[PDB]
Amino acid sequence: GSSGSSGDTVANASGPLMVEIVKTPGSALGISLTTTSLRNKSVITIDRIKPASVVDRSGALHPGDHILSIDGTSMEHCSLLEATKLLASISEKVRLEILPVPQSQRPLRPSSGPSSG
């Protein structure tokens, strides 16, 4: 009579936003992150994206977004090196968990308009 707890191992799917990006197989896009301070701890964010890339051409990530997690990696006690390593360790789609920001608050939103490129 000990241990147990049979329900779910962390499951919300409401707070953080999963910004997936269908990149090339074993290929690097060019995502640049930039960590900063606050008061007691720091936070990993996005510095800038690469031009003519899957993230830029698609418009998934953006400079300034607050990354909450990546591929199941909490961005509460991580660094720039660790985070950058996660983006490189991708098979096809990058599991980037970003906070609901005004710049991006949808995994698959419509894109209408004459020009787009």
UniProtKB/Swiss-Prot annotation:
Instruction: Write down the superkingdom of origin.
Output: Eukaryota
PDZ domain span: 18-102
Kindly list the places in or outside the cell where this protein is found, as annotated in its UniProt entry: Cytoplasm; Membrane
- What's this chain's function? May play a role as a localized scaffold for the assembly of a multiprotein signaling complex and as mediator of the trafficking of its binding partners at specific subcellular location in neurons.
What is the annotated quaternary arrangement, including any partners?
Interacts with EFNB1, EFNB3, GRIA2, GRIA3, CSPG4 and GRIPAP1. Can form homomultimers and heteromultimers with GRIP1. Interacts with the C-terminal tail of PRLHR.
Record remark: domains = PDZ 5 mediates the C-terminal binding of GRIA2 and GRIA3. PDZ 6 mediates interaction with the PDZ recognition motif of EFNB1. PDZ 7 mediates interaction with CSPG4.
Q: What family, per the record?
A: Belongs to the GRIP2 family.
Q: What is this protein called?
A: Glutamate receptor-interacting protein 2
Give the gene symbol: GRIP2
Q: Which part of the complete protein is shown?
A: 238 to 341 of 1043
